[PDB]
Design a protein around this ligand. Sequence first.
Ligand SMILES: Cc1cc2nc3c(=O)[nH]c(=O)nc-3n(C[C@H](O)[C@H](O)[C@H](O)COP(=O)(O)OP(=O)(O)OC[C@H]3O[C@@H](n4cnc5c(N)ncnc54)[C@H](O)[C@@H]3O)c2cc1C
Ligand SMILES: Cc1cc2nc3c(=O)[nH]c(=O)nc-3n(C[C@H](O)[C@H](O)[C@H](O)COP(=O)(O)OP(=O)(O)OC[C@H]3O[C@@H](n4cnc5c(N)ncnc54)[C@H](O)[C@@H]3O)c2cc1C
Ligand SMILES: c1cc2c(ccn2C[C@@H]2CCCN2)cc1-c1ncc(C2(N3CCCC3)CCCCC2)s1
Ligand SMILES: c1cc2c(ccn2C[C@@H]2CCCN2)cc1-c1ncc(C2(N3CCCC3)CCCCC2)s1
Ligand SMILES: c1cc2c(ccn2C[C@@H]2CCCN2)cc1-c1ncc(C2(N3CCCC3)CCCCC2)s1
Ligand SMILES: c1cc2c(ccn2C[C@@H]2CCCN2)cc1-c1ncc(C2(N3CCCC3)CCCCC2)s1
Lengths: 487, 485
Amino acid sequence: KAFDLVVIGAGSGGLEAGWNAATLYGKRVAVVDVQTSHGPPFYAALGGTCVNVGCVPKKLMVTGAQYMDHLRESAGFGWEFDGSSVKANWKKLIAAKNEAVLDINKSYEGMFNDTEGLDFFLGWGSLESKNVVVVRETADPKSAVKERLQADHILLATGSWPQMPAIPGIEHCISSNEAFYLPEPPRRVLTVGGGFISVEFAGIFNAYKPPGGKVTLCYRNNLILRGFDETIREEVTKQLTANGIEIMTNENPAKVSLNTDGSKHVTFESGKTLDVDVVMMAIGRIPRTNDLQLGNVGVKLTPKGGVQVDEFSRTNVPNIYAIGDITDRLMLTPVAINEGAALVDTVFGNKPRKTDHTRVASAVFSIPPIGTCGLIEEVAAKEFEKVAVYMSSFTPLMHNISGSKYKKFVAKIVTNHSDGTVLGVHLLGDGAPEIIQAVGVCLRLNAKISDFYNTIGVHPTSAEELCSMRTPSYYYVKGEKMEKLPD
Amino acid sequence: AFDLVVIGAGSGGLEAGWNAATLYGKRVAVVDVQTSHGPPFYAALGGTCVNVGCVPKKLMVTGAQYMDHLRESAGFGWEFDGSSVKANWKKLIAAKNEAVLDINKSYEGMFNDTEGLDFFLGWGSLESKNVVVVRETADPKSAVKERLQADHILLATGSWPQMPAIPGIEHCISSNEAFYLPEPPRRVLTVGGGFISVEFAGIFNAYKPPGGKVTLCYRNNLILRGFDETIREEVTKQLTANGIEIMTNENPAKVSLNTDGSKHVTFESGKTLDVDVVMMAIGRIPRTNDLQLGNVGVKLTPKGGVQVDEFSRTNVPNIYAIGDITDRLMLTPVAINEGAALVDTVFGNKPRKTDHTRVASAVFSIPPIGTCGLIEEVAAKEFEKVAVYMSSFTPLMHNISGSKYKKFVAKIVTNHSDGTVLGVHLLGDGAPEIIQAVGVCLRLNAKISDFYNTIGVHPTSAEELCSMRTPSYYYVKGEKMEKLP
Ligand SMILES: Cc1cc2nc3c(=O)[nH]c(=O)nc-3n(C[C@H](O)[C@H](O)[C@H](O)COP(=O)(O)OP(=O)(O)OC[C@H]3O[C@@H](n4cnc5c(N)ncnc54)[C@H](O)[C@@H]3O)c2cc1C
Ligand SMILES: Cc1cc2nc3c(=O)[nH]c(=O)nc-3n(C[C@H](O)[C@H](O)[C@H](O)COP(=O)(O)OP(=O)(O)OC[C@H]3O[C@@H](n4cnc5c(N)ncnc54)[C@H](O)[C@@H]3O)c2cc1C
Ligand SMILES: c1cc2c(ccn2C[C@@H]2CCCN2)cc1-c1ncc(C2(N3CCCC3)CCCCC2)s1
Ligand SMILES: c1cc2c(ccn2C[C@@H]2CCCN2)cc1-c1ncc(C2(N3CCCC3)CCCCC2)s1
Ligand SMILES: c1cc2c(ccn2C[C@@H]2CCCN2)cc1-c1ncc(C2(N3CCCC3)CCCCC2)s1
Ligand SMILES: c1cc2c(ccn2C[C@@H]2CCCN2)cc1-c1ncc(C2(N3CCCC3)CCCCC2)s1
């Protein structure tokens, strides 16, 4: 049992690395994971966090939640039906999501069965020595050895895990992992955190809650979605509120106790209280380092806690590499994929390649959604003497007719005003995740604002607003926001 | 005494007029036959796109998409009384009419509030090289209202539905009248394979009353000529899957009235069909007849467009033509771009010409199309080595929604000598929005490697464009083969 590559973690990065090494370069590859399909007790599984308890099921569930808006919005276009007959069956949503994820699990299991030199091992991987991965029955080092895999190269690709704050009654709370399997939709739920997971699940629960229900999102600071464009952070807050979600800023739970009926009594640091049926912690995700026994071989962590790597994903230990969320950088599936492919090209393909972590496009599947690529203006204004911001914002016509007039589309382009180079593009509104993909290609080509406004529009779309902005709306000069340039 | 007289207050004409008055302080007259949408002349102030084109058709396709949303919601756990469901066409048209009227009124205000920018109601024609006559009707013998003296004349009158010369053609409508049908037809035949026929087949399919049937006929073998061929076949299948009957290699030979007022269609093959509405959508032709072009000698192309050069100049010195009347790319953003460039050149001292290559466009079919640049059989004739990248897949949601037939198709066509992307063709939800920034990419001469070294946004349909690294097949000297020699 002597492999060219042993991958610990059969997820977005690990599977891309293993498949490429086996099929592009003829190498003998072992991949370790703890389950062959989604769900409790370990949640993630073959396919990784995105497939099993991440991007794939959450996108299905947001899609389900959007029908609340569609069914109401249809009336402005003449659709008539018994509005009081409308009900949402949560069990059906979960059951259908489970079937779709399981189809992917089954597909990947067929990939392993049929692909030469690509072998799957069920169990918990850890480092025994610099060239041996041990696979045990459980995450505990005292559990029994199942096999010892001799490895010329070892790839750490175990992902991240939900961070749970140490408050009394944390044990009465859940994370996103369990939210994917709730037996009933909560009539009242508190999602804790201001990041994409809290926001995305707020909108899911808001659509499936039974009558008399309320979704509350809380966030420790003043404005949700830190790191996103500030106009969009503010507009999403308004459009969430408009759809019935209570957003509770500058608040943070201090404890949770059980009510007589099994509901949860939340007390915030402020002294406020709230009764909910479910408390979902989504305050962050931390690199999954705890079970690998990295200290056995000396693999170093960063001051933040991710596995430390260079730009070629090398740890401090020769022939041990790390990619994806365990490196605690950009926690995105396509970045883990790109890193895995680059690693295998370099190590086995005599084709050195490194992942570019700038100008990466990403999305938030709030309702409506966010699509973004590159720098927000605050960040550009620190790196560039003259920054211009082009901004267009409006409720689309379709949504004046639908009756969802709160659904303002936002398009913003951030440039280095010295040569017009586009530094960032930020979008809020229907179709934004789809619009922004090719924008990432544009930024990788160093597009300037004039390449956008001299491209002929596609009409009628939201995307054509990106090609309709010729004149800055305002500027940052040496960090100072101002409407007109000096002089 | 006008710097510029514009005949046609549409997409191209209003952009030229506004820019000439507000950017360069010029004195501008703009003529159109109606101040607000609808019968009898359909187009009006704002043009075809505002009144009976892109804007109302997009609203109506959006309405039609609810038929799919209501049905697909069930797979995600939504229930409601299906027998209570009605698609109320009258409400749809009423909401659309008010949206269009709002824009009509906005442009009316533009004219009332902008100095140097003046509107004249009536029919414009060329009396002489420097005079536009405005009459009460399209009849050249109708009464004169105004005679506008013009340093420069802009022909921007658009295009008009083509109608075949068959007995009974008068009982057939065009897209113009479809926007104003008082009731949704139970049985409709749309005639033609182009985008308007396809888009309206989807609209009628959603709003038809019980017992209804939409039939689309096309005189040749495969609809949507000029679009990527993989997409033509697959959109045919997905229309069929949603209950539309596609009747290829058929063409109406005559139409008569049944005793209930419905239409009896006889095809050249001798087949017959009874329908409530026959909608002819076989083409749009440049709208030249009423302009009395023979007065001043403006030359036409063999196919009826006003001949222009790259700067939109006719053969008569201070007479120009933009938009659909030039019979090139009949798209609103192209007409807008031609108008703005023309004004920059004539009045701005910055010669600008419209680039008509690599223009992104869409079809709001259900499912929709997004396209930019060359299809592969055209590229194969201009380039010695062509690579075609192709991916088809089912979006995640349609493993749940009950609409398994909704395959997404992504195709990239390149010059295989240097990897330059010559065309991108998309079929599936999101495609019109995806393709806009693809147009920017092609203007930057993106190569295929620029797409596949860009990191995906996940999960989206658009990331498929960044996930194709190896040609599926090639054309070498115009010959299709799976592998290069
Ligand atoms: C709710 C949620 C939504 C998300 N939505 C998006 C989205 O829309 N878009 C996006 O790009 N990203 C999204 N992400 C992030 C994305 O899921 C991750 O960035 C991606 O999965 C990281 O891939 P990875 O290869 O680093 O590890 P993972 O994909 O997490 O795979 C790691 C694997 O390691 C296994 N494992 C762990 N410990 C061991 C061990 N000791 N031995 C063996 N196997 C082990 C786990 O079972 C798991 O299968 C989301 C994440 C979450 C939680
Ligand atoms: C059903 C349909 C759907 C369409 N959908 C799209 C789409 O989604 N996207 C897209 O980009 N394009 C679309 N188009 C095409 C778009 O409408 C045209 O390309 C665009 O309007 C052309 O602009 P123009 O300046 O050439 O003329 P138009 O906008 O057609 O304006 C011409 C104007 O001239 C007026 N007029 C005509 N003759 C005279 C005269 N003698 N005197 C005075 N006034 C006169 C007419 O009333 C009209 O208002 C669609 C067209 C149709 C018919
Ligand atoms: C599935 C199933 C597969 C095989 C091979 C055999 N069977 C089973 C067969 C299929 C038909 C009948 N039974 C391969 C697969 C793959 N799915 C995805 C794969 C990619 N990535 C690599 C890792 C996960 C992600 C690489 C290729 C591009 C897309 C992403 S490889
Ligand atoms: C299936 C499915 C695949 C992909 C890529 C994406 N999805 C989609 C699935 C859906 C969920 C997860 N991803 C690839 C496949 C393949 N099937 C067979 C393949 C091989 N040969 C190649 C020629 C025919 C035989 C390759 C060599 C080893 C096995 C045989 S590659
Ligand atoms: C288990 C196993 C599950 C699935 C779905 C699939 N598989 C098995 C998969 C597929 C084959 C092998 N792997 C879901 C579950 C659960 N859903 C809810 C669970 C409970 N709690 C609430 C959620 C967290 C824990 C409530 C219900 C009673 C038990 C505890 S356990
Ligand atoms: C409307 C209405 C307008 C005015 C001016 C006054 N009033 C009436 C007033 C305004 C406040 C209350 N009522 C202007 C307009 C215009 N609408 C669109 C115009 C643009 N394009 C040029 C024309 C064709 C389309 C101009 C360039 C930007 C893009 C759109 S100009």
